[PDB]
Amino acid sequence: HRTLLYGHAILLRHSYSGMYLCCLSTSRSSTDKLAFDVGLQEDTTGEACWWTIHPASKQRSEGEKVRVGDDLILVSVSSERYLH
Amino acid sequence: KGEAIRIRSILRSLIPLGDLVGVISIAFQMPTIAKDGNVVEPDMSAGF
Q1: Quick one: three-class SS letters along chain B?
Q2: How far from B45 is each of A4, B28, B41, B42, CA to CA, in Å?
Q3: CA separation for the pair B42, B29 (Å, rounded)
Q4: Contact A53, A70 (CB under 8 A)
Q5: Interchain proximity A33–B10, CB inside 8 Å
Q6: CB < 8 Å to B2, chain A
Q7: CB nearest to B14's CB, from A27, A33, A80
Q8: 3-state DSSP assignment of residue A47
Q9: Which phi and psi angles does A67 have, rounded to 5°?
């Protein structure tokens, strides 16, 4: 039971399917070119399934622990994009 | 270096290969020597 701290690499697992949220290399996005698609992946290995939490506003600070009800910005490690 | 592969992938996504090939294949305008053969050089401040 470690605590979420802003900037940490978090792993999100789908409770039902059992796969993990990931940034798919496929580009289905409508004329976005540099954007990817967000899906589910089985294997945990690879930076794709890992996301980094960033503070939404100036109330929170980098390295501070995350609190319930806060807003987040999730950054993919492999692609360096945001959940948009 | 994952950063290096990421940079290359980003640049490849930005610029398709076919676009570069086509721009390289775009033709030029060469000077002509007509009407007594005086050199008619196209202006370069407007040209390709």
Answers
A1: CHHHHHHHHHHHHHCCHHHHHHHHHCCCCCCEEECCCEEECCCCCCCC
A2: 59, 14, 12, 9
A3: 7
A4: no
A5: no
A6: 47
A7: A33
A8: helix
A9: -115, 155
CB proximity A47 to B under 8 Å: yes
C-beta of residue A77 within 8 angstroms of C-beta of residue A50: yes
Contact A33, B14 (CB under 8 A): yes
Coil, strand, or helix at residue A73? strand
Q: For residue A32, what are its two tokens?
A: 């976005």
Experimental technique, in short, is cryo-EM
Q: What does the alpha-carbon distance between residue A54 and residue A70 come to, in Å, rounded to a whole number?
A: 11
Residues 48-77 of A with CB under 8 A from B: none
Instruction: Enter the resolution in angstroms.
Output: 3.3
Task: Look up residue A55 and give its two tokens.
Answer: 């503070």
In single-letter form, the type of residue at position A39 comes to G
Which residues from chain A sit within 8 angstroms of residue B10, using beta carbons? Answer: 34
Phi, psi angle pair for A10, to nearest 5°: -105, 150
What dihedral angle (degrees, nearest 10) is formed by the CA atoms of B14, B20, B23, B24?
Answer: 160
